[PDB]
Amino acid sequence: SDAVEPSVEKEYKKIISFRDTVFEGKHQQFLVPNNVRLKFLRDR
């Protein structure tokens, strides 16, 4: 029943900005290589 909560946009803004930085791979906490790149993009 948690298919689309109130949480969704809130989750998206925080998650999307975090993921998008990693998508550039310049994430201060996380440097991402090849396998991680494909994992992010293919799964979501």
Partner: protein, 49 residues
């Protein structure tokens, strides 16, 4: 995206991929994100500690 996956779960999977690079609540906190987000989604995604 919205190809079979619901918006909420779509947000969750993006978190799960983040989880593979090792995102913990402290990392989310470093980005201004609440620790509760890692912990709660961690439970929902059924991720092993």
């Amino acid at each position: 995206g919205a190809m079979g996956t619901t918006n909420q779960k779509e947000a969750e999977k993006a978190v799960s991929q983040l989880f593979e690079v090792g995102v913990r609540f402290n990392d989310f906190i470093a980005e201004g994100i609440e620790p509760s987000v890692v912990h709660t989604l961690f439970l929902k995604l059924g991720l092993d500690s």
